[PDB]
Amino acid sequence: GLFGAIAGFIENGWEGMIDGWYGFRHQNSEGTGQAADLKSTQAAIDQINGKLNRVIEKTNEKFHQIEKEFSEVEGRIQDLEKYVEDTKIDLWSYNAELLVALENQHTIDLTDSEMNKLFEKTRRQLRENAEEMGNGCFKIYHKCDNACIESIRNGTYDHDVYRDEALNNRFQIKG
Amino acid sequence: GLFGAIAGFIENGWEGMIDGWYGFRHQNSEGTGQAADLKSTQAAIDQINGKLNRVIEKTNEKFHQIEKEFSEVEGRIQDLEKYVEDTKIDLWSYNAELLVALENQHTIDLTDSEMNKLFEKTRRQLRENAEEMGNGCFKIYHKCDNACIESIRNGTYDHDVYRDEALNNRFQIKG
Amino acid sequence: GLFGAIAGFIENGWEGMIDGWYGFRHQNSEGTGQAADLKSTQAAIDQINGKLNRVIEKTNEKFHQIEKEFSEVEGRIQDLEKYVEDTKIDLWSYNAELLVALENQHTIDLTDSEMNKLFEKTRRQLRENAEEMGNGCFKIYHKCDNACIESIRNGTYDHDVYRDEALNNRFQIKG
Amino acid sequence: QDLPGNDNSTATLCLGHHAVPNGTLVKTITDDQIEVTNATELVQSSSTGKICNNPHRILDGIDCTLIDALLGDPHCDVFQNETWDLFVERSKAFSNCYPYDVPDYASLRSLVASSGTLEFITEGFTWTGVTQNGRSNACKRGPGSGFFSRLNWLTKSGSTYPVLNVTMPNNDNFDKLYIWGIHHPSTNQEQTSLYVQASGRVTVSTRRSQQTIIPNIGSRPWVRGLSSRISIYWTIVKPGDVLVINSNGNLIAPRGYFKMRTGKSSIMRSDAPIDTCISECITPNGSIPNDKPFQNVNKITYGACPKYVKQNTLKLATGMRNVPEKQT
Amino acid sequence: QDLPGNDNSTATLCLGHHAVPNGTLVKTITDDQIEVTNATELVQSSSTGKICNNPHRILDGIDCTLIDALLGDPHCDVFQNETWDLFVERSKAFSNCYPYDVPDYASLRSLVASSGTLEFITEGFTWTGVTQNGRSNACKRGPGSGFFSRLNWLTKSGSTYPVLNVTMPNNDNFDKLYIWGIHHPSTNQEQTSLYVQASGRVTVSTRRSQQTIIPNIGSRPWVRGLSSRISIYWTIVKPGDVLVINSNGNLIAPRGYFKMRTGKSSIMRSDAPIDTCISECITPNGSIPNDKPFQNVNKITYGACPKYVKQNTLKLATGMRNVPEKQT
Amino acid sequence: QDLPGNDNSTATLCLGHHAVPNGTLVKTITDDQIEVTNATELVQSSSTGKICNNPHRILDGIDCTLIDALLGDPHCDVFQNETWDLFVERSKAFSNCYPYDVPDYASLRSLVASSGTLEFITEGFTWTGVTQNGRSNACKRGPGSGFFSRLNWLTKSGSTYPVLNVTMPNNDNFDKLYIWGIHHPSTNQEQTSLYVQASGRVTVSTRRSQQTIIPNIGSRPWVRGLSSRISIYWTIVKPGDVLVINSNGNLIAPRGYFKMRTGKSSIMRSDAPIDTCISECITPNGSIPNDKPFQNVNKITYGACPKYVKQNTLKLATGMRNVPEKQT
Ligand SMILES: *[C@@H]1O[C@H](CO)[C@@H](O[C@@H]2O[C@H](CO)[C@@H](O[C@@H]3O[C@H](CO)[C@@H](O)[C@H](O)[C@@H]3O)[C@H](O)[C@H]2NC(C)=O)[C@H](O)[C@H]1NC(C)=O
Ligand SMILES: *[C@@H]1O[C@H](CO)[C@@H](O[C@@H]2O[C@H](CO)[C@@H](O[C@@H]3O[C@H](CO)[C@@H](O)[C@H](O)[C@@H]3O)[C@H](O)[C@H]2NC(C)=O)[C@H](O)[C@H]1NC(C)=O
Ligand SMILES: *[C@@H]1O[C@H](CO)[C@@H](O[C@@H]2O[C@H](CO)[C@@H](O[C@@H]3O[C@H](CO)[C@@H](O)[C@H](O)[C@@H]3O)[C@H](O)[C@H]2NC(C)=O)[C@H](O)[C@H]1NC(C)=O
Ligand SMILES: *[C@@H]1O[C@H](CO)[C@@H](O)[C@H](O)[C@H]1NC(C)=O
Ligand SMILES: *[C@@H]1O[C@H](CO)[C@@H](O)[C@H](O)[C@H]1NC(C)=O
Ligand SMILES: *[C@@H]1O[C@H](CO)[C@@H](O)[C@H](O)[C@H]1NC(C)=O
Ligand SMILES: *[C@@H]1O[C@H](CO)[C@@H](O)[C@H](O)[C@H]1NC(C)=O
Ligand SMILES: *[C@@H]1O[C@H](CO)[C@@H](O)[C@H](O)[C@H]1NC(C)=O
Ligand SMILES: *[C@@H]1O[C@H](CO)[C@@H](O)[C@H](O)[C@H]1NC(C)=O
Ligand SMILES: *[C@@H]1O[C@H](CO)[C@@H](O)[C@H](O)[C@H]1NC(C)=O
Ligand SMILES: *[C@@H]1O[C@H](CO)[C@@H](O)[C@H](O)[C@H]1NC(C)=O
Ligand SMILES: *[C@@H]1O[C@H](CO)[C@@H](O)[C@H](O)[C@H]1NC(C)=O
Ligand SMILES: *[C@@H]1O[C@H](CO)[C@@H](O)[C@H](O)[C@H]1NC(C)=O
Ligand SMILES: *[C@@H]1O[C@H](CO)[C@@H](O)[C@H](O)[C@H]1NC(C)=O
Ligand SMILES: *[C@@H]1O[C@H](CO)[C@@H](O)[C@H](O)[C@H]1NC(C)=O
């Protein structure tokens, strides 16, 4: 949608991630793994529920109204009784049709946004120690075991701890 | 608009680009050259047509309705016939006025978005071999002939092929 | 909101910034300082006023209409006079309620956007001489006195002037 | 600083989102079928088929319309002094008493339907000079002839029908509804046989209003043995006002007043069965749940109901776009 | 890799978007004139000026209103048994027969206009004791006097006008529309000359309804030589019901029934020329194209038409912002 | 380039946004209370309490309703030929002349209310054979009896009430409104005492229309000493048409015509004080300012007013989210 993460630079979803809406997959020298990110999952979920509750907010009640079905032909007054109702129904149907179109459009950009925000957040944390492979994956240029992967995920990763190892691996090489 | 590419970090449009809505101008070894990007052009065009078709979706038909012009003065019932129509017209006019304002607002951010997405996509591909000049142009720090420019544009550019040449040119220098 | 700057990577606002909506706080060789950014403040303000004026655009006027309060019980025709008005009021109330919800949602993403745009603009200007600390602050890796801070803020900063000093400080170190 | 010791390697971390095998198509500002992870339906399109008898007070009219219950058709005597939040009229209802017509039937049915009560107070009208309690074999009450329980057919006594001039003050603090009528004979002979005068006249008035109706002699179609008709009228008398009934022939007199109230009552035509269940929204198709915001069951509703909409399905996306690994 | 890859040059790649010299201003949530590359107009604001005679069946009333075509004014005899999807009434239409008035003209014009047919079936009413086919010099049919083709003016035979009491059963399976009337004489002399009785009376009824009208003697303004008037009434008779017409003077009798149907027909007042072309939307200003979603030509429409809106222009942006590179 | 910068230090630059201590909660598509820096109220919810007498022409009816001002109740003679943009009717208004009723009161009050003028032109009707200017002690004008200033009660001359047959052409180029009426006596004796004939009749007509009303004798409730009533009617006569008034008893004749116009006038029921101030929007609760888009003061308005809405507050965010740094 507007941010180009979902169905964008992230090629496709993971049918296998059953524990959250957004998450991480990694491959290091100790193995491969997957893990949902619960904060961005909750952020997306809460906004969609907020939106949902606003839409289901109070059915108003109406009691005696006007007749809407007639068995005899009467002319002028019954023509008006029918026209008031038919123009009321088209106006409420327009409203319903526009409301879900705007809402759905926004739900797709909102979830695209949370994906991109989690990507950016992880980018900012890895600092000079990783490079973006451009497909939603970072190449971490230093040895990062499963506790290192866990610290990026739970947001406690210290880039300084691995900066020189990373900068060496990343740049120096032979050019 | 929301992304700040169009009428933002990209100073102005190219009246000369007649073959697409978004594209590339380059200046290299063999000279200067321009080329439309057809994928982002199509992405912008398709969304605007989708939006367009939804708005032109079915004129509903109405046959016998109520009278809307009167030649005698009648009082209570004619007052109501006139009031039902006048409040119907104001409600549909409000709807038309709001619909094009939201739509237009969104068309401007959607196209701003595609510009920025194409910029980001090219950024991600050039990896460590280019720098953003901050005006929508990348400085490519390695020799890049016309086939090199065409591989960035058609999305097959391999950064590794030029990484050491680039990294040398870009960093080393004398500081 | 959609961009994740306000109430996002920028942890909180400054109650102390009284001279603008967006701005800078630095620390450099000459001391500490704060300064509002007037261009992004004006950009946010103008869009919010534009939006505001559109909403206050012309109260339409109405003169003779239908009766809306009755003292006797009449039946069929009075039932219709009441139903036309009650359905007119619910339709306008739906409209008012949806209008401020969309508007407010957009005002929060629009201001989130201007924050992020000012951040990006500053990023692009500092080029290879600074790093993002990921909290909305850049670490400038070269000596930058008050006039250097002023040139970033007023948009005349030349990165080349400090590039080797910065690149040395930033990378070389000991890894 | 941190000392590597020996190892030199890299890791890969990839961010991603879920996807589901199934997925639902939804409309958008720019697409009209785009697939998302999950959606929720906003249009209620099915009724239970039964009118739940709770929380509103449903009164099933069985084979009485509300006007016959009001007038007091013998077969609707079950409904005297009855009350309702919703009176349900059935397609099978039939009238079976003196043939009558009501000039503005629709307003009288409305006006009683929302008052919500058939509470009747008998008042001591004194009709001097006429024969009270006339009844007809087209309105059988039990084995005998009969008439509407709430109306009193006056005919001559002996050889005269006087000018009736009666009055009934509204001394209470509420409005009183008076249902009265006029008899249209089939023949001039019938007119004089019953009312002596060859031209009747009924004038019913208050300080605020007056109705004078004069009868119309002529043959109408045979209905339950009769070509005559009575037409029904109504007068509301406000607190402090006074009713004066003045006639010279053909008056079908009131026996007292219905009392009027102000409430949430209404009437509904439906053949749906009433059942025991609680449901706030009633539709002539039966109750429906008001959990969704819009409904497509019927434009006629009573209670807390969803807004009727022409569409029968509107799905609200409750998840991100579905971009599966394989296909859909 | 290579060997010492020494060619230290660089390249520049710039991304950009198009711009046009021209450009269109559009309204936005935050701006009311912002310039975009291209836009499309959503309000239809011009008619062709002609009512296309296709796909709907347009019936041009020429100088007949629909009610005169119904009643059978001599000059509208062209329209007998005619049908329409839209009947167009012209401002030039004129009546030219016995001066009449229709108590609820507006409902009779509506009710016939959407039935869409003037199909008339003559029924064998037998009027015994009166002179049929009365005609007038204010309603010339050919050289002679005449009357409405679908009405039958009964007057006395010799010295008496009996009490007419006729009946016509609806034995078909459709509703029947009966147009009848009553004559209001100018003088008591005229009343007795024609109808003998000094006070006429017409009662038309079914099992469901009854109308009794009594005439009103007095001078009205001279219209085509006459001060008298006839007033028109209508009765619909449902399948299985029965019409009973009972009168004692002044009856203008029906000659049979119009048949009623249910359809998409309506009536429109317009002096626009009908022309050959296909157009779905008709406006009294002529047809308009329903390609746009809103229209500002006229609030009166028939057919598949755009929604009428007060605005005369609403441009929908179909392109990005126009940020020109000079402007040429 | 430059020489040895002995010291090589770093700087920190942080971008941020403001925040306020206070802050306002607003609704959103996804939240219904989110705190922003500032907001503006879009619902006007309070009246001044006074109807400003500017720019519209307010006419305070004092203790006259518009119909009594029209008819010419003695106590409303102040309003003759008066004009208004808005006529304000007060709850205290009372009638104090001959007891009358108006069959379609609501349409006559509407029709005069938007014409906006009580300009009356007296015309030379010649009533030959009857006694003009009848007056009553229930309509005291000064010490004496009186009647409505704009109506003329005709009674017999000596022993006869002729058949009146008068005509008044509309030769001007505007529509004329004629208010006339009919007297309903209480007794047959009253009928013959005044009008000789035992059954009156009034027929008022134009080329286009006709009304015949016949009186109704009978006792109504005592109102200002009387049981009789007069009922009011109206006839509009278009340019080029002609009025013919024909009666044989009980006519309450017009004295001329009110002239009709087309404008922005209306009528309002309010007990609010009129005051001097300029305000475009009038509500029966007093004027309100139309600076906001929506209002919740009253659904009844006149002038350039905000759209009435059920909500009493709707805040539009005019600032960013408020994310303060201290605790609470
Ligand atoms: C005026 O004309 C109408 C229509 O011709 C007459 O109505 C008909 O009157 C007869 C005799 O009363 C009715 O007959 C009865 O019908 C019932 C049901 O079939 C039956 O039980 C009796 O034995 C008898 O046959 C007939 O139904 C009725 N028809 C209609 C449509 O009303 C009326 O009698 C005439 N009146 C005068 C005073 O001439
Ligand atoms: C009741 O009063 C009305 C109005 O004064 C009388 O109407 C007028 O009657 C005369 C004589 O019939 C009409 O005259 C004819 O007019 C036409 C056109 O000018 C002309 O061709 C004839 O030679 C003749 O002059 C006059 O038009 C008519 N005016 C109106 C407005 O209707 C009516 O006759 C009176 N009736 C009685 C019984 O007293
Ligand atoms: C028909 O019946 C009505 C109701 O019974 C009679 O009305 C009543 O008539 C009397 C005598 O005229 C009225 O008396 C008046 O009372 C007022 C005080 O309220 C007093 O100021 C007068 O001097 C006089 O005494 C009485 O008010 C009136 N009541 C009503 C409700 O109208 C009427 O007179 C009867 N008519 C005939 C012809 O029988
Ligand atoms: C983050 O992960 C590391 C490794 O598991 C652990 O030591 C640390 O405590 C974690 N922090 C939090 C807040 O979970
Ligand atoms: C991309 O450009 C290079 C140079 O023209 C060419 O060899 C390559 O095949 C192109 N790939 C595609 C998919 O066009
Ligand atoms: C920017 O700041 C520097 C230092 O104050 C100053 O010399 C320069 O002129 C400024 N430029 C502008 C446009 O303010
Ligand atoms: C789909 O959305 C609705 C509303 O949010 C929710 O009740 C339902 O559980 C969701 N489906 C799944 C599989 O989460
Ligand atoms: C109806 O209610 C009234 C008021 O309590 C009572 O006097 C009357 O007798 C009741 N009649 C019947 C049939 O219940
Ligand atoms: C509800 O009832 C109406 C009329 O009885 C019928 O046409 C309609 O299709 C029904 N809809 C449902 C969901 O039962
Ligand atoms: C402008 O937009 C309309 C609708 O999308 C399209 O038909 C038209 O060709 C566009 N104009 C140009 C120059 O592309
Ligand atoms: C009108 O149509 C009916 C039904 O077919 C027919 O019997 C009748 O004679 C027709 N009359 C004319 C004038 O066409
Ligand atoms: C259409 O017709 C109406 C009334 O005839 C006229 O006022 C209006 O301006 C016309 N508009 C157009 C586009 O012809
Ligand atoms: C809040 O917004 C309104 C409308 O924009 C403005 O008049 C007011 O001054 C604002 N408040 C502050 C403190 O700026
Ligand atoms: C009312 O105005 C008319 C027209 O100028 C005038 O002839 C008439 O005498 C006026 N009457 C009063 C009481 O002002
Ligand atoms: C306005 O007046 C109405 C009726 O007089 C009253 O119910 C309402 O509360 C009033 N509102 C205000 C703001 O005065």
Short mmCIF file of N, CA and C and ligand atoms in Angstrom, two decimals, chain F residues 80-81 120-121 150, ligand 14:
data_model
loop_
_atom_site.label_atom_id
_atom_site.label_comp_id
_atom_site.label_asym_id
_atom_site.label_seq_id
_atom_site.Cartn_x
_atom_site.Cartn_y
_atom_site.Cartn_z
N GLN F 80 -52.27 46.07 9.96
CA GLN F 80 -52.80 46.14 8.61
C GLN F 80 -51.73 46.58 7.64
N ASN F 81 -51.65 45.93 6.48
CA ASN F 81 -50.69 46.28 5.44
C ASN F 81 -49.23 46.10 5.86
N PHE F 120 -53.52 45.09 1.72
CA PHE F 120 -54.89 44.81 1.32
C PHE F 120 -55.42 45.93 0.47
N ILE F 121 -56.10 45.56 -0.59
CA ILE F 121 -56.68 46.48 -1.51
C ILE F 121 -58.17 46.28 -1.40
N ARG F 150 -61.35 42.81 7.61
CA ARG F 150 -61.26 42.46 6.21
C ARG F 150 -62.40 41.59 5.67
C1 LIG G 14 -52.99 49.47 2.30
O1 LIG G 14 -52.22 49.70 1.10
C2 LIG G 14 -52.99 50.01 -0.09
C3 LIG G 14 -52.05 50.18 -1.34
O2 LIG G 14 -51.27 51.38 -1.32
C4 LIG G 14 -53.77 51.30 0.20
O3 LIG G 14 -54.59 51.71 -0.91
C5 LIG G 14 -54.64 51.05 1.44
O4 LIG G 14 -55.44 52.19 1.72
C6 LIG G 14 -53.75 50.73 2.61
N1 LIG G 14 -54.56 50.64 3.81
C7 LIG G 14 -54.07 50.86 5.04
C8 LIG G 14 -55.01 50.66 6.21
O5 LIG G 14 -52.90 51.20 5.22
#
